[PDB]
Design a protein around this nucleic acid. Structure first.
Lengths: 152, 60, 77, 87, 50
RNA sequence: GUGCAGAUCUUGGUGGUAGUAGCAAAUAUUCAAAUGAGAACUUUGAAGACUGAAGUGGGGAAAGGUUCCACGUCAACAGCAGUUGGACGUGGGUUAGUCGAUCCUAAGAGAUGGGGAAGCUCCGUUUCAAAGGCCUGAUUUUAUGCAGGCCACCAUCGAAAGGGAAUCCGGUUAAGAUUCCGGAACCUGGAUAUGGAUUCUUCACGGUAACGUAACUGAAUGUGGAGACGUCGGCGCGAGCCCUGGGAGGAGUUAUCUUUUCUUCUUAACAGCUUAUCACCCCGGAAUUGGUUUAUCCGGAGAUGGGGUCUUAUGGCUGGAAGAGGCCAGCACCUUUGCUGGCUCCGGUGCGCUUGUGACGGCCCGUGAAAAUCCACAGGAAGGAAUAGUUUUCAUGCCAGGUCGUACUGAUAACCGCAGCAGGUCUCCAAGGUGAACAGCCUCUAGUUGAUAGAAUAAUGUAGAUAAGGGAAGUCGGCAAAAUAGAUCCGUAACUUCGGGAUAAGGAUUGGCUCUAAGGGUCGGGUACGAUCAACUUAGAACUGGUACGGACAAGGGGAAUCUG
RNA sequence: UAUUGGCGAGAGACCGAUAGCGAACAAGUACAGUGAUGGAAAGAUGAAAAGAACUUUGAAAAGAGAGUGAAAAAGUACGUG
C-alpha cells in the first residue's frame, strides 16, 4: 500500500502535524480507500486515525528550581556570569529609587504632612543624594518637621 | 508560540507593510495589515496641530 | 453591525420595505450574580446593515414578537 | 570568487522579449533590441553578418502575401471570375 | 514569476502543449519517417530562456 | 578533387590502464507487518535520534515553468537499489470592486518645435513654437454654432520594497482561496426617492472660550494642511507571546510520593458609546520662588492650583457573536454518516521577549525625496421661501465596479553554477531552561531520520586527543598545540596628545543547603502608625563534601623594547 | 551591357551522405550564450508488413519452438557489414 497521501490529508483534517497522526496498521485496506477529505473525516470518527497527543515538556524541574531562587539559593558568586550592570542596570535601580522618593514627597505634600517649601528642598536633595531609600527620606522629614517646630 | 506570515506578496518590512498580530475567533494567531497612521492637520500660521479636526488619511 | 436601543425605533425598522427577513436569537445568560435568565436578540437584516435589539425582560419579549409584521420571515434560533 | 560563487547572483534579466522579432534580445534599460530593434523602423542587419541575414530575410517565414504575387503576375493581374465551361 | 505578465504566461501555455510525445498513429502513416518527438523539452534539462 | 603511418593532423569508433581510483563532510539507525517476482532503501506501526524556533519549521521577492495533485507505471534518470520519485504516460488544478499591476512621481529615459550631421542619427525636454480645453451661458429650427469670464500648467515612460480609495471571520479541495461558500462590512462612480434639517430675521443654533453637533448653500481665484519622511539613546503606554492562581473538561504517572505532569477555556473586519500624553481655554495673579522629568526645563509673553475643550494612536463595554471555533460526554450504525446534551469562567504579575506608538533628548560644514490625490479656509459670483421654497458634505433606499497575475519550490533536489554540485542567492514570524545574551548546550510545536551498504580493525593518512622528567635544546622563525579566560573584591607601572594606557601587570573568592538583613505597591487620618499585596537584587552567617564549586558549555596569555604607518 | 537576389526553364567529362550548400531528414532545426552571434549530428528492412497467429519457460524484457518471406546470414538495434 501507499498511505502517504492519507498521512498528509489526515494532518490537515485533524489540525496537527504529520508526526502526530496515527494510522491503524491493521486497517490499511480501509485507509487506502480514503482518497477524499470527507472520507478521512470519517476515519477520524470511527477511531481509525487518531490525534496522537502532545509530547510532554514538563516545567516542574523549572518550578522547583525557581522556588529555590525565590527562597534565595543559587545566587552566589559562582552562579553569576554577567556583570552587575548586566543583571540589573544601575540606571534602573536609580529609576526605581528616585520614583519612590518623588512619590512619597508628592504624597506627603498633598496630604498636608509637609508644605510646599519643605517639598521643593526635598525634591532637589532626593534628585541629588543622601536619601538612600524611603526610610532615609522619612526620618529626614520627621526630623526637619520637628526641628522647624522646635525652631518655632 | 504560534508563528505568523504576511498576507500579501510584499515580503519586506516596509512602511506600507506593517503587521499587528491579532487573535481570530478560530483561536489562532493571524497577522493583520495596518495602514500608516494619520497625522493631525497643522495650523497654516504657527504649524501646531489644530484641535477639533479629525485626523484621517487624506482621502478619508 | 449596529445596535438599536429604542424599541419603537426597532418597530419602524421592520416596515422599511427592504427588510424582508429577521431572526430571534435566544441566549441563556445570568443576571449579574446568580440565577439564569433568558435574553433574546431581535435581529432584522436591512439592505445595508444588520440591526440588533437585545431584550432582557422575557415578558417584554413576548409582547414584541406579536408586534412584528406578519410578512417578516422570522427565523427562530 | 569570480566563478561559481559569483554565478549565483545572476537572476536579473538584461534582455526580455522583443515585440518585433520575439527573440529575447530586447535590452530593458536601453529599451532597444539587439537583434532587430524596436526603435528605428530599419531592421538591424549588416553585411559582415552574412549568416545573420540568412536567418531573417524574406522567404524564411510564411510570406502570407508574397506567396501569391508571382502567380498573380503570371496571369497579368486579372479581375473578375472565370465564367463557365462544359463537363 | 509567480506574479507574471500575460506575455510570459502565454509562452508557457504554448510550451505546455508541446510537452507531449508523438501521437502514436503518426508512425503508422505511409512513408512516415518520424520516429519520436525530437523537440521534447523538460524543465530540468533545458531552460526555455523565457 | 588520383595512391598515407606519421602533420601535439580532422571526424567517428575503440583498448590497456581496470572491475582499478573510488562511491568516507552535514552525529544514526533498528524491529515487525504490508505490498511485490524481488525490499538495507516503498508504506504503516514501534523504538532510537536530529534540526532546536538567526530551524532541517511556516510564508514570500527574483528566478523557474507545471516541478503542484491524482491514477497507471519501471526501458532510461535518482553515480548502490527501487514496488518509490521533482522520472515515464495520462489527466486535473490557479475564481478578486477591496491582494498586486493598472494611477503618481524619483534618479533617469525620451518624442514634438527647433538646431547639427553626407548619413546611420545626434543634441535638447520648455527649449528663439501661433503648442491645449475648463465651467456655463446662448439654443426651445436643433444640433451644439456661437457669447461673457477665467485657467497657461506646454508630451510620454520610469517603483509587483516608495506614494496609494476600499474585506474580515468561519468552513470547504486530491491540488485554490483575504478570490469559492455562509455571515457581516467598507470604498468609488452613478442616478435618485422619502424622512430629518433650514427658512416669515431667508442660507442652523449652543458655549465667556477652547469648541459642540445628524445636517446647517458658496462658482472664479487665492492661501494652507495632509500625502511628506534621518539616525541613536533612555522613559511611558498598548498589542501579541512568555510566566503564574482558582475553577470547569480530557490525557499521562501512581512499588512509594505527587490537591501532581500535560492540555482546551478563543473573539476578526466594521460600527455605537466611552477612553490620553501633548496642546488649548476660563477664573486667579506667583520670591519665602514654585511646578516637574530617568534625563533641568518651564512660569507676569501669566506658573502651581480649581474648572473645562480637543486629537481617539490606544484600551473598555455593546453590536458583529455564539448560531462560529474549541474541549468533552451519551446514544446510534454494512450506510450518505448522524443525533442530543453540557462547558467554553474569573483573575495576577513584570528592568521579561518581539513590535507599534507617544513625549523627549543626543548628533551633523550630513538637517535626512517628489508627485498624483484629498480636505479646509478666505472670497462672495450666483441661485434663492410665505400660501411656500431651499438644501443631498445628515439617515435610509437603488445600480454597477472591467483587464491581467493568482498552482508550487524558493533551495545540501524545483534558481544560477555543463549536475539532484558541501558554492552563491533579498526578506517576515520566532517557545521553555541555563546563562548578560538572537552565544554555546538540552527540550516543546512543526519537519526530517535524506547522504551506497555489509565485515574486519594492518601500515600510512585525515579529523580528535593524552603523555612521565626536562621545557623551545626543535625550527628561518614558538609554525602548531598548550597555557589564560566568566563574575565579585583588592591592586595597578613607565609613558601620555591628560582623553588614555588598563581586563595593565599581579592576587583572592566562587557549589549545595539552612538562615539573617536591606531595597517596594495600594488603602482609610477633622479643619504618630496599621492592614494588605507583590517583586528578584545585593550583602552577611552557620553547616556540609575525597578542597570541590565560571565543575559541561562558553571564555584575554602577559611583559621590555626597535623599525614603520 | 551587368546580374552569387527573385521567378520559370534547360543542362554537366561536377559531388555522391566525414563528399556536395551549414542543412539529401520536422535544418538555420536541436543546442550554447545576458546579448551580438555560434550552430551540429542524423539517408537505405523487404516486391509487398506478408512487422512473427499459436504453444511452452519466465514476474517481465525476452528465450526456445512454430510461422511469414526468395532470403531473418533482411526482425522497425533492420541493404552489405
Amino acid at each position: 500500500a501507499n498511505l502517504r497521501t492519507q498521512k498528509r490529508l489526515a494532518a490537515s483534517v485533524v489540525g496537527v502535524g504529520k508526526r502526530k497522526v496515527w494510522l491503524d496498521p491493521n486497517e490499511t485496506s480501509e485507509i487506502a480507500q480514503a482518497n477524499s477529505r470527507n472520507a478521512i473525516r470519517k476515519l477520524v470518527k470511527n477511531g481509525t486515525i487518531v490525534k496522537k497527543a502532545v509530547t510532554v515538556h514538563s516545567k516542574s524541574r523549572t518550578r522547583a528550581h525557581a522556588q529555590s531562587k525565590r527562597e534565595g539559593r543559587h545566587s552566589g558568586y559562582g552562579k553569576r556570569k554577567g556583570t552587575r550592570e548586566a543583571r540589573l542596570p544601575s540606571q534602573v535601580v536609580w529609576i526605581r529609587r528616585l520614583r519612590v522618593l518623588r512619590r512619597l514627597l508628592a504624597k506627603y505634600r498633598d496630604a498636608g504632612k509637609i508644605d510646599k517649601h519643605l517639598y521643593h528642598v526635598l525634591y532637589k536633595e532626593s534628585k541629588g543624594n543622601a536619601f538612600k531609600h524611603k526610610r532615609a527620606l522619612v526620618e529626614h522629614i520627621i526630623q526637619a518637621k520637628a526641628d522647624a517646630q522646635r525652631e518655632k | 508560540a504560534q508563528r505568523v506570515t504576511f498576507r500579501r506578496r510584499n515580503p519586506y518590512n516596509t512602511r506600507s507593510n506593517k503587521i499587528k498580530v491579532v487573535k481570530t475567533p478560530g483561536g489562532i494567531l493571524r497577522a493583520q495589515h495596518v495602514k500608516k497612521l494619520a497625522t493631525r492637520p497643522k495650523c497654516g500660521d504657527c504649524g501646531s496641530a489644530l484641535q477639533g479636526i479629525s485626523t484621517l488619511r487624506p482621502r478619508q | 453591525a449596529r445596535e438599536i436601543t429604542d424599541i419603537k425605533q426597532f418597530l419602524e425598522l421592520t416596515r422599511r420595505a427592504d427588510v424582508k427577513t429577521a431572526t430571534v436569537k435566544i441566549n441563556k445568560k445570568l443576571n449579574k450574580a446568580g440565577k439564569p435568565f433568558r435574553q433574546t436578540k431581535f435581529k432584522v437584516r436591512g439592505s445595508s446593515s444588520l440591526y440588533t435589539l437585545v431584550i432582557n425582560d422575557a415578558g417584554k419579549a413576548k409582547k414584541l414578537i406579536q408586534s412584528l409584521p406578519p410578512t417578516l420571515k422570522v427565523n427562530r434560533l | 570568487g569570480k566563478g561559481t560563487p559569483s554565478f549565483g547572483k545572476r537572476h536579473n534579466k538584461s534582455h526580455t522579449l522583443c515585440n518585433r522579432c520575439g527573440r529575447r534580445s530586447f535590452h530593458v534599460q536601453k529599451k532597444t533590441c539587439s537583434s532587430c530593434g524596436y526603435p528605428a523602423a530599419k531592421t538591424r542587419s549588416y553585411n559582415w553578418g552574412a549568416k545573420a541575414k540568412r536567418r531573417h530575410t524574406t522567404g524564411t517565414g510564411r510570406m502570407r502575401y508574397l506567396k501569391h504575387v508571382s502567380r498573380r503576375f503570371k496571369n497579368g493581374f486579372q479581375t473578375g471570375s472565370a465564367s463557365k465551361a462544359s463537363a | 514569476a509567480a506574479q507574471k505578465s500575460f506575455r510570459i504566461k502565454q509562452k508557457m501555455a504554448k510550451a505546455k502543449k508541446q510537452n507531449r510525445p508523438l501521437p502514436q498513429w503518426i508512425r503508422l502513416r505511409t512513408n512516415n519517417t518520424i520516429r519520436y518527438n525530437a523537440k521534447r523539452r523538460n524543465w530540468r534539462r533545458t531552460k526555455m530562456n523565457i
